[PDB]
Design a protein around this nucleic acid. Structure first.
Lengths: 206, 54, 122, 119, 115
RNA sequence: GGCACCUCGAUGUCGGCUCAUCGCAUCCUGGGGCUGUAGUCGGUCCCAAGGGUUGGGCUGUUCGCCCAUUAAAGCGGUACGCGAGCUGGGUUCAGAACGUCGUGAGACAGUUCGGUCCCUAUCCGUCGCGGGCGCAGGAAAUUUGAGAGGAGCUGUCCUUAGUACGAGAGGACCGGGAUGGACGCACCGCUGGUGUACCAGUUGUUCUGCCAAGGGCAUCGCUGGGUAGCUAUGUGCGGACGGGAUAAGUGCUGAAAGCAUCUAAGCAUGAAGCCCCCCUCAAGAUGAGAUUUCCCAUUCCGCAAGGAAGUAAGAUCCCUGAAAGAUGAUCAGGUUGAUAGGUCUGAGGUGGAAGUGUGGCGACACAUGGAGCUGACAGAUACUAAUCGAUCGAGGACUUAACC
């Protein structure tokens, strides 16, 4: 398989030479560098781990600097790895850029979600709330615990808690335009995560 | 909404094991002599970042 | 979004004036009707002389709503009121002459007959 | 965003207006930390306003700051004292006319005091 | 961000548009294709709104048709708005002229500023 | 229903709302056998619990009956689930009445009108979030996956094809294609909603000595809009293709028992079912895993059992913050720096500021001028604040292989 890692800059709409209107997700991705080529006979499996954008020497520490000095680049802030790629396709230290994708290709997209915080059950899992009138003192409560005979509540009754911050994958997205000059991506749809955040883009396994 | 049993001594201490309060952060004043917080102006010397404040 | 029990204005010569959606068809529980789909309904008030009287269950399609209708180009169509036309099951209207502007969505929903008898199509 | 300061908008706006008038009054404020942090920006846009120093500016700053006495022997009101003296003093530094000095908290409630002075 | 957005959409935003205020009256030509038979339906009306920016800029227009008022909306820079021209210059006060839906019949006067 | 076994030093009783969960004696969807199964439809029976299993009218009603849809409108268990979650319509108080019974006070699983539902969560349990310690040095990252979760639902239309079948009527199996309903996930460009330090108009009163221009209060005084953020009714996507082992079933070969026989030996096929494939968590997995990179094995003491005291890598305290946030935590930053607030330039929004001058008795309208103003938005800018500091944090036991 094939895939890159970038930073989500924004999202807008773009016309596609037919009259219909196509909202798009805008992702800038400076050319990534493979730092380590994970191989089967020592790592138990094959993979490539690669870094996305630079860091200043102030925030760079000595261990990661020594790790990067094999591929002889600037230190990388954002490092992830992919599985299922062609093992001999990528030499260590080479770039991947943006042009390995072409417009019209179905795409698996994965990113962290927008963090929201401690929300109630109403927001968290969207089950309805009680009456707002006719004497109801049950305005926004999260429902009954469960039966009596098991003498305890079961695991996984869905309760108020924190939202967000947990990575989510949208499948079968379609890349509508690639701008290799500015190192930009432009995918139809809506991509999860806050602005200027992590976003990784993969070829769809479907 | 009622304690069904009394809480024993070791349970009480075990709850209170985190209720201890931390020390502040001191730093030696720019003007000599005494102790001061970080990012607070000096109470005694009346100075901060080497500069004097009335 | 035409919804269950919404009162509708009629825009043809079938004699019905105000109809009352029984509920919408399609899936098992359809909470909504947008432009184009058949809704079963009863008639609340009517002209004296008409093919349909007051108070019988009939089948109809809404032809113009006040909530917007979205076309693929990016345009939207919307109106000031809600109207529908009574359709018998031959998928063509009961009245012989309809009034007012009608949306284009009833083209690709196969409705050339009412589209032709429409006085104006936007 | 911007802080709420534990009060709704009416007396909040009255509070900030009163503090910034006090700032122009005596060029040095002792208050709590968060009042100082939200104080800084507003007094320094009034300082930009006074640096602009035209008649639209006079009326705009009149609509926010209040009329105290600032130099009583000259009967100098706060508006004119701003618009004459302080704009001419700080016309050159294109921003950042405020400083925050933090102190130990009060005996009464441990509220973190700050020193605000215009410099 | 908005720098990169406008550079990526400059090639697609249209240019041949007379500048208009949302209290004026227009006719707009659309190239709607019905049965692979391309033809132009003209749409005469009055702007009610002009909202957005970049190519997210959009505007909308009202017309009274057979006693029924209609909203028509478009994005500003679609390829498939063929021709647009101003017929008459309006004088309004509001930026958004929303009350025209309530105001039906003559009492919806738009004054000719002749500017 | 019978018995009276725990509870009368209190175990809250119908129905409804919110929330589920389990069984299968399966309502639909899946696979089959028989048919008095031609085909479209069915009847029964078997395998199958993965998922789903509608809105109204009436009555307190479960239940029913009716209206309209749907593939279907399942049956039951969980103190007739669920009141320290909610409801109080009815039964189950005290008032009052009707019918009836009683000489009467009064009474009726007879009716009718009205009728106080307490609790600051201790421990289990549940949902999130932190600190310590461990993982025979000390750190920064990347991971493996045991093992957990979730999704796992369906219609309609076109074609095959008016083709097989059928005197006819009518109408397919299998296979392709398009599109939808409901759910869930994500997110503001669009449609909008909100938007209480944004803008504009406007009444009363009061205040800034007066006019002008403004301030306060009147639900944000009212009204029309509206940035960011949040958001659905708005937008994008999913439940695809597959593999393996199967259930009911269909078999191939073949004796026991010269035949027969899906059977005992062997070899197959066969489900929305099981395990994977999809998504997420996951080494406290004490079995504490793996990879790469950095720090090195200093100073003293009993010399040695082992301690203590400075440190390296690297962290922390403290400070500026938000894309994160109840606080912790996370992340961006801390003077070789764009972290936040200013300033300037913008986007966008409100929309024609004041002051002038003209016309007009006048309220007013014009030009100056897309002017004036602008919370969160995005670029630059060292202007102001992230200063001096401090604290923590390595020196490593037996054997087999192997070579100083």
């Amino acid at each position: 398989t094939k895939g890159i890692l970038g930073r989500k800059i924004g999202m807008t709409q773009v016309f596609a030479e037919n009259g219909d209107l196509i909202p798009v997700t805008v992702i800038e991705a400076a050319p990534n560098v493979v730092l380590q080529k994970k191989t089967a006979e020592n790592d138990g499996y094959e993979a490539i781990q690669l870094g996305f954008d630079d860091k200043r020497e102030k925030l760079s520490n000595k261990p990661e600097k020594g790790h990067v000095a094999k591929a002889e680049t600037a230190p990388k802030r954002f490092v992830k790895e992919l599985r299922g790629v062609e093992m001999d396709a990528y030499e260590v230290g080479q770039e991947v850029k943006v042009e390995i994708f072409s417009a019209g290709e179905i795409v698996d997209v994965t990113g962290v979600s927008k963090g929201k915080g401690f929300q109630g059950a109403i927001k968290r899992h969207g089950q309805s709330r009680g009456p707002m009138s006719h004497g109801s003192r049950y305005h926004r409560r999260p429902g009954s615990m469960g039966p009596v005979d098991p003498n305890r509540v079961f695991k996984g009754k869905l309760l108020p808690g924190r939202m967000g911050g947990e990575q989510i994958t949208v499948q079968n997205l379609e890349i509508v335009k690639v701008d290799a000059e500015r190192n930009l991506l432009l995918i139809k749809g809506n991509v999860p995560g806050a602005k200027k955040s992590l976003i990784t883009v993969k070829s769809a396994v479907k | 909404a009622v304690p069904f049993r009394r809480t024993s001594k070791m349970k009480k201490r075990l709850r209170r094991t985190h209720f201890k309060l931390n020390v502040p952060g001191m730093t030696e004043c720019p003007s000599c002599g005494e102790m001061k917080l970080s990012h607070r102006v000096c109470k005694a010397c009346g100075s901060y970042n080497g500069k004097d404040i009335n | 979004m035409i919804q269950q029990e919404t009162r509708l204005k009629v825009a043809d010569n079938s004699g019905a004036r105000e109809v009352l959606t029984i509920k919408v068809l399609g899936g098992s529980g359809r909470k909504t009707a947008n432009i184009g789909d058949v809704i079963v309904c009863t008639v609340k008030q009517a002209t004296p002389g008409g093919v349909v009287k007051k108070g019988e269950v009939v089948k109809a399609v809404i032809v113009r709503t006040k909530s917007g209708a979205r076309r693929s180009d990016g345009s939207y169509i919307s109106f000031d009121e809600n109207a529908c036309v009574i359709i018998r099951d031959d998928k063509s209207p009961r009245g012989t002459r309809i009034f007012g502007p009608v949306a284009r969505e009833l083209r690709e929903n196969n409705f050339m007959k009412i589209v032709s008898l429409a006085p104006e199509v936007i | 965003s911007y802080r709420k300061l534990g009060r709704t908008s009416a007396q909040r706006k009255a509070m900030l207006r009163d503090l910034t008038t006090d700032l122009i009054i005596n060029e040095r404020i002792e208050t709590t930390e968060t009042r100082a942090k939200e104080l800084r920006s507003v007094v320094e846009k009034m300082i930009t306003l006074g640096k602009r120093g035209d008649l639209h500016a006079r009326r705009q700053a009149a609509a926010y700051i209040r009329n105290e006495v600032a130099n009583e022997e000259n009967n100098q009101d706060a508006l004119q004292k701003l618009f004459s003296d302080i704009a001419t003093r700080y016309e050159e530094r294109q921003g950042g006319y405020t400083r925050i000095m933090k102190l130990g908290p009060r005996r009464g409630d441990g509220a973190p005091m700050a020193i605000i002075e215009l410099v | 961000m908005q720098k990169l957005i406008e550079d990526i959409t400059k090639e697609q935003l249209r240019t041949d548009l007379p500048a208009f205020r949302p209290g004026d009256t227009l006719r707009v030509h659309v190239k709607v294709v019905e049965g692979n038979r391309e033809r132009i339906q003209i749409f005469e009306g009055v702007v009610i709104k002009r909202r957005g920016g970049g190519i997210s800029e959009t505007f909308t227009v009202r017309k009274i048709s057979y006693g029924v008022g209609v909203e028509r909306t478009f994005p500003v820079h679609t390829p498939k708005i063929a021709k647009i021209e101003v017929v008459r210059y309006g004088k309004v006060r509001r930026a958004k002229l929303y009350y025209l839906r309530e105001l039906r019949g003559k009492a919806a006067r738009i004054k000719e500023i002749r500017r």
